[PDB]
Amino acid sequence: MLKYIIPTMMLMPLTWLSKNSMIWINTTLHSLLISLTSLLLLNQFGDNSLNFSLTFFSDSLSTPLLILTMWLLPLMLMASQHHLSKENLARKKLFISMLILLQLFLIMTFTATELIFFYIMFEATLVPTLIIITRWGNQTERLNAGLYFLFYTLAGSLPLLVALIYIQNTMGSLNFLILQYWVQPMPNSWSNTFMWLACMMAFMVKMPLYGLHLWLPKAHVEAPIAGSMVLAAILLKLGGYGMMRITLLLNPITDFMAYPFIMLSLWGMIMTSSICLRQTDLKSLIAYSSVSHMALVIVAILIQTPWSYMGATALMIAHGLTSSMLFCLANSNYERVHSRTMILARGLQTLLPLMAAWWLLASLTNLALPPSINLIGELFVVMSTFSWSNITIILMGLNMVITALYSLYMLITTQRGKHTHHINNILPSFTRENALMSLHMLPLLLLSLNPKIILGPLY
Amino acid sequence: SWDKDVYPEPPRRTPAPSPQTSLPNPITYLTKAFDLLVDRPVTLVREFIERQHAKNKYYYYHREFRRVPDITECHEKDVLCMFEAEMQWKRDYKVDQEIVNIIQERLKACQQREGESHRQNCAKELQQFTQVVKAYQDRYHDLGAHYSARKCLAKQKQRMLAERKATKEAA
Amino acid sequence: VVRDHWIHVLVPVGFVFGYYLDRKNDEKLAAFRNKSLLYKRELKPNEEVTWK
Amino acid sequence: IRWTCARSANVYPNFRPNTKTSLLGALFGIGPLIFWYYVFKTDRDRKEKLIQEGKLDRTFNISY
Amino acid sequence: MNLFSSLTLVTLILLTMPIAAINFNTHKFTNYPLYVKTTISCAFITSMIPTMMFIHTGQEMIISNWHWLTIQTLKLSLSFKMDFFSMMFVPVALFVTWSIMEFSMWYMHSDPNINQFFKYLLLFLITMLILVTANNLFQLFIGWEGVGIMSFLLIGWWYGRTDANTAALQAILYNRIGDIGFILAMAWFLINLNTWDLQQIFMLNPNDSNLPLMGLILAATGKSAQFGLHPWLPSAMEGPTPVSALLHSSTMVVAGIFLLIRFYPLTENNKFGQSIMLCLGAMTTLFTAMCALTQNDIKKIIAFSTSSQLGLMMVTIGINQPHLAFLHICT
Amino acid sequence: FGFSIVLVLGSTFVAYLPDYRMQEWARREAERLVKYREAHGLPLMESNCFDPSKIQLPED
Amino acid sequence: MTGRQARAPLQFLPDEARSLPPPKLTDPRLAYIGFLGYCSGLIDNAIRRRPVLSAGLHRQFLYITSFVFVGYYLLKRQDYMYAVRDHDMFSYIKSHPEDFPEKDKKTYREVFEEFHPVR
Amino acid sequence: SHITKDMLPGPYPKTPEERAAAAKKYNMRVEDYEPYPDDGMGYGDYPKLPDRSQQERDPWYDWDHPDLRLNWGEPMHWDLDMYIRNRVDTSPTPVNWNLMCKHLFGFVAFMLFMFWVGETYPTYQPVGPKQYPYNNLYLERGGDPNKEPEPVVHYEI
Incomplete structure (x- = not known):
């Protein structure tokens, strides 16, 4: 695994000692090389995980997320120019090295063994997101966005540390195996309820669950495109990965103590799909869409079926790709007109007649068009929750209906019917945005063909 | 190829149509021309590819493992017995699921080949399906997501103790 | 053509380096060379190895 | 611009917690949640007690 | 027969x-x-042969291959049945x-x-074909949402015209209420028969079946313009003419009753089910015929007439007579 | 270096590799085991996966 | 935990510390310390306006040397401290057998733990 | 750019200078500026409009924005995202609203009651059940190979 760690380090002094018109080719080329390098990883088989050291290992939950990270970096690094190429050379170099240090801590986080090391790398994942979104937050409340951001994430993720240290010095060390092979059930004293509440509540904050999603919309409407793609895809599915691991302990009380959170997630899934039907600020619709899919994720995690975990990891990866793509398209439209509002920039079936093809394709994946992965995820989660109860399918289907209608509203609102004909500045599509769309939607359809890779440990 | 022992087939049954017409028989003309004009060149090409691959020989071996003992012959915490125990158990778990898959494919083949008389001469295969799936339902069903081995043995002990109390009360 | 530019050659050198170091670390981690109950044959035919 | 800034950012200022605001807040925010909570308790306690009797149709119910 | 399977699979692959x-x-x-016209003609002449052989x-034969995610006790290959x-x-x-x-x-x-336009129309044909052929029920669900979304695009062919994309919005919404019924049906078949495949459904005939039958009924009355969920039909006539012709001649209009036809062994019994069938269809037929006047x-x-004929086919499923309803489909 | 070396090579490399999580191994192993348990009469898929001789119920 | 022969004066490295294995050449921790020293010299260029990577090469070599040295002595002290903690633990184990009794291995043929299924 | 005092804190009071300010700000007639009022629901000081307004505004005026009936400067009714045509069409109906709902509920209620009258009273053409050949066509229903014969016969009548 250090074979992946150390070139990701050595991609950083690269970016320092290149120059003008010289940083870019090196960073992008070598980051794609690292993407092939971790495409080499997928060996994982049968009996257990595979151990990359006395220290690192990979569950098959961790392999597709890790490959998704190393896929998503060069895409991002191409995507985040033309809104900062006119800024200074030193600040631009600082930006690229910030993202590389970010990816380094994400690989550190996904290939963890010890949950304390996982926690350190969790908040080391946090601190570059802050600096990026505050330094290029590009609107007047990036202040409040970063402030809300860091205090929700830390003050939720703070007692998680205390609970894990307590488990450390009541049950020996913290390999995931020695967390396994030695876990004994823990009954319903109220201390157990608070310990479960601490761990699950910290990751609930990071998903988000419904009562703590106003963390999100400021932190995506006032972000640059790089930090937004980072934040959405890698950080929300990182929180889900954490709960997916540490739910191995504390199964004998999760049944008794899981009832409020499921109901919060269900009624909030309906409410969030409703609230993204009427907002302006098109950038924020993807954020509330993300809360809807993560609410479905949380339903899938708290029910504990192998069906549910297969659906959960597929829904993770497909929603990560959908949201990262759709953020990149919304940034394309904001590069066109300086609005961010929804009802302004209209028309565009006429003009840029193939930008609309990518809008159509992403909108139908967010619909969950059926050969895609997102329907695989949502369908298996609905199967598992119907075996959970004979009643919840009202909520899931009504989620499907309202999800269809807001996603279609995003499609046919801004890109259908009449150009406002006082725009007269939009350029025909560059090669770059076409390349970014091409890098999103080739792997989504290629996994739509052969998806046995991305299903979880309980394959 | 496969083992026809484990994938049984019903014995073949085919009649010969005897017109009793004078148009006659367009589809016979078409199927003879089909065989002569489709089935000949692919036969020659498969001959060619068969020689080109049988010029040198490979083999792939069916992998086989041993039998490390059990969870019941493992000590308190003592990982180095439990590790072999659980990998032995989990490989039995995967092969047991695929046995269920094979029973279900037999059941589908019986549905299609026996035709619209459903309940004729699939009922022994239906019988063994309900038998094996009663076993699977009793043994691996309600353990949930983090099945390791210990919940499996807990289900085992608790089940047979409940049955022991039931037969003690019935006697 | 190495002294033309050495910037671009760095990350495969680093990749080979980390790969070599993981080889050395797992070969320092050479306990239980044959002592499993499930993978245990004799050393054969010549030199005393089953994974390196 | 004026409509958008009125619609989103000029909500939280301005506000005071009135009887109408607090009443409708606790009604349309907590009401459906607590209602759905009790009905899923009821359905789950039915199904748990019923398969605790053992007379459910789970003769083959593998895909749980 | 190798001829039979060969000619059917090339009737697929010519599209x-x-x-x-x-x-x-x-x-x-x-x-x-x-x-495109001559490849549709060649698909026709290849499709005339094995039907006459049948x-x-x-x-009477099924094909089944390329299994992907054969995960737990189930499996699913791309498979379709003649x-x-x-x-x-x-x-x-x-x-x-x-x-x-x-x-x-x-x-x-x-x-x-x-x-x-021809690419969309042929794409709609492909999805209608993969809908009508399959027995692996996930592939039916593939064909379902694909014919829904091709209906969406070809109704909203003429962009501009705010009434047109309004109409397309109604169409895709009633497709999704068809989807909630259909996925409830898939839920019950998975959790009580260990698959979702037509053949094992027919092999192990259950007793209590009211929840999946209500799901299937919802699927048909969403999909095929029946009462309560009908009025996306003049909405569907907002579009261009040959789109509308193919949309409500055979393809995409019969897919609601095609499913209930396909599950005739399950809707043998449950007289409560057959009563729901024919009462709902009579309601559809009277309301759209009464609305069709003036x-x-x-x-x-023409759309209201096609809703009336579909209501007759719902009544035909209400009586245990599925094959006359299929005769009605073709004519 | 983004499609011409990544995309099609990744398509080959993940289109096939060995049996990821022991799939076809399990197919053929179950084939041979069910053929054995037909060819020696004993019922296929014995319930009670652990041996009841090596079990000890606690008592009342 | 407390000295433990503060009697027996402060004694930065005891003469019983010449039995442990020393930290070897190019051990990774002092390699990290040298990286920190290189970075310290680099920011030492960077505070004032003297240019980075150059015109300070004696200072870079100086900071590398000094930090690697100080880390070397502290690595030796660190290894000694863990050795004395382990030996005192095992001495208190062997000193009283009366209070750390041998847990006889109840193997899993007889150990009873309940089930509590997640449906 | 955008002035600080073209945002909008606080409702109506006091009526001289604040209503003059909102009339200068939102570009309206002075005594047609209506705040909501202040029940504290948020809502700031944005106007009330006549609220239907989109199957209104007859389409031959030739304003600026063609599919929205905008004129670049109207103060833009608060709930506009619910009123783009394609979302909610509030036409003046050809009949009423009350007459509509009473007749629709009446028709569907009467027809469902007639369906219940059908459900209690079937038709049948007067014919007994069929004469299945082997014991109500046994052995070819659900199974039962040698368990029990179920003797029931048919007579020529």
Whole structure:
């Protein structure tokens, strides 16, 4: 695994000692090389995980997320120019090295063994997101966005540390195996309820669950495109990965103590799909869409079926790709007109007649068009929750209906019917945005063909 | 190829149509021309590819493992017995699921080949399906997501103790 | 053509380096060379190895 | 611009917690949640007690 | 028979060249309408043969291959089945669509966006075919949402015209209420018969079946313009003419009753089920015939007539007579 | 270096590799085991996966 | 935990510390310390306006040397401290057998733990 | 750019200078500026409009924005995202609203009651059940190979 760690380090002094018109080719080329390098990883088989050291290992939950990270970096690094190429050379170099240090801590986080090391790398994942979104937050409340951001994430993720240290010095060390092979059930004293509440509540904050999603919309409407793609895809599915691991302990009380959170997630899934039907600020619709899919994720995690975990990891990866793509398209439209509002920039079936093809394709994946992965995820989660109860399918289907209608509203609102004909500045599509769309939607359809890779440990 | 022992087939049954017409028989003309004009060149090409691959020989071996003992012959915490125990158990778990898959494919083949008389001469295969799936339902069903081995043995002990109390009360 | 530019050659050198170091670390981690109950044959035919 | 800034950012200022605001807040925010909570308790306690009797149709119910 | 399976699979795969062709050509073929028409004609003449072989003797066969995510106790391969309905419906739909290809060669003489129009129309045909053929029920769900979304695009062909995309919004919404019914049906079959495949459903016939039958009923009354969920139909007539013709001649209009036809062994019994069937269909038929009087737009009239005939087919499923309803579909 | 070396090579490399999580191994192993348990009469898929001789119920 | 022969004066490295294995050449921790020293010299260029990577090469070599040295002595002290903690633990184990009794290995043929299924 | 005092804190009071300010700000007639009022629901000081307004505004005026009936400077009714045509069409109906709902509920209620009258009273053409050949066509229903014969016969009548 250090074979992946150390070139990701050595991609950083690269970016320092290149120059003008010289940083870019090196960073992008070598980051794609690292993407092939971790495409080499997928060996994982049968009996257990595979151990990359006395220290690192990979569950098959961790392999597709890790490959998704190393896929998503060069895409991002191409995507985040033309809104900062006119800024200074030193600040631009600082930006690229910030993202590389970010990816380094994400690989550190996904290939963890010890949950304390996982926690350190969790908040080391946090601190570059802050600096990026505050330094290029590009609107007047990036202040409040970063402030809300860091205090929700830390003050939720703070007692998680205390609970894990307590488990450390009541049950020996913290390999995931020695967390396994030695876990004994823990009954319903109220201390157990608070310990479960601490761990699950910290990751609930990071998903988000419904009562703590106003963390999100400021932190995506006032972000640059790089930090937004980072934040959405890698950080929300990182929180889900954490709960997916540490739910191995504390199964004998999760049944008794899981009832409020499921109901919060269900009624909030309906409410969030409703609230993204009427907002302006098109950038924020993807954020509330993300809360809807993560609410479905949380339903899938708290029910504990192998069906549910297969659906959960597929829904993770497909929603990560959908949201990262759709953020990149919304940034394309904001590069066109300086609005961010929804009802302004209209028309565009006429003009840029193939930008609309990518809008159509992403909108139908967010619909969950059926050969895609997102329907695989949502369908298996609905199967598992119907075996959970004979009643919840009202909520899931009504989620499907309202999800269809807001996603279609995003499609046919801004890109259908009449150009406002006082725009007269939009350029025909560059090669770059076409390349970014091409890098999103080739792997989504290629996994739509052969998806046995991305299903979880309980394959 | 496969083992026809484990994938049984019903014995073949085919009649010969005897017109009793004078148009006659367009589809016979078409199927003879089909065989002569489709089935000949692919036969020659498969001959060619068969020689080109049988010029040198490979083999792939069916992998086989041993039998490390059990969870019941493992000590308190003592990982180095439990590790072999659980990998032995989990490989039995995967092969047991695929046995269920094979029973279900037999059941589908019986549905299609026996035709619209459903309940004729699939009922022994239906019988063994309900038998094996009663076993699977009793043994691996309600353990949930983090099945390791210990919940499996807990289900085992608790089940047979409940049955022991039931037969003690019935006697 | 190495002294033309050495910037671009760095990350495969680093990749080979980390790969070599993981080889050395797992070969320092050479306990239980044959002592499993499930993978245990004799050393054969010549030199005393089953994974390196 | 004026409509958008009125619609989103000029909500939280301005506000005071009135009887109408607090009443409708606790009604349309907590009401459906607590209602759905009790009905899923009821359905789950039915199904748990019923398969605790053992007379459910789970003769083959593998895909749980 | 190798001839039988070979000719059916090439009736599939002949509908797969032209999309990849103008996705790969970029040198604009002038002969593109003639090309799509002649491949639909060749698919027709390949489809005439094995249906006549089927009526000639029987030999009634399924294909099943390329299993992907054979995960737990279940499995799912791409698989489709030649019995009677998916056997000899496909010539009628190909024949109708072949004539509409002619008619849209002429009718759409005056648009440069004609090539994309034929790509969408052939794509809609592919999805209607993979809907009507399959027995692996996930593939049916694939065909379901694909014919829904091709209906969306070809209703909203003429962009502009705020009434048109309004209408397309109604169409895709009632498709999703068909989807909530259909996925409830899939839920019950998975959790109580360890698969979702037609054959094992028929093999192990259950007793209590009211929840999946209500799901299937919701699927049909969403999909095929029946009462309560009907009025996306003049809405569907907002679009262009040959789109509307194919949309409500055979393809996409019969997919609601196609499913209830396909589950005739399950809807043998449960007289509560057959009562729901024929009472709902009689309601649809009277309401759309009563609404069909005093109308003056032609396409609204023809659509209301097609809703009336579909209500007759719902009544025909209400009586235990599925094959007459299939006869009604083709005629 | 983004499609011409990544995309099609990744398509080959993940289109096939060995039996990821022991799939076809399990197919053929179950084939041979069910053929054995037909060819020696004993019932296929014995319930009670652990041996009841090596079990000890606690008592009342 | 407390000295433990503060009697027996402060004694930065005891003469009983010449039995442990020393930290070897190019051990990774002092390699990290040298990286920190290189970075310290680099920011030492960077505070004032003297240019980075150059015109300070004696200072870079100086900071590398000094930090690697100080880390070397502290690595030796660190290894000694863990050695004395382990030996005192095992001495208190062997000193009283009366209070750390041998847990006889109840193997899993007889150990009873309940089930509590997640449906 | 955008002035600080073109945002909008606080409702109506006091009526001289604040209503003059909102009339200068939102570009309206002075005594047609209506705040909501202040029940504290948020809502700031944005106007009330006549609220239907989109199957209104007859389409031959030839304003600026063609599919929205805008004129670049109207103060833009608060709930506009619910009123783009394609979302909610509030036409003046050809009949009423009350007459509509009473007749629709009446028709569907009467027809469902007639369905219940059908459900209690079937038709049948007067014919007994069929004469299945082997014991109500046994052995070819659900199974039962040698368990029990179920003797029931048919007579020529």
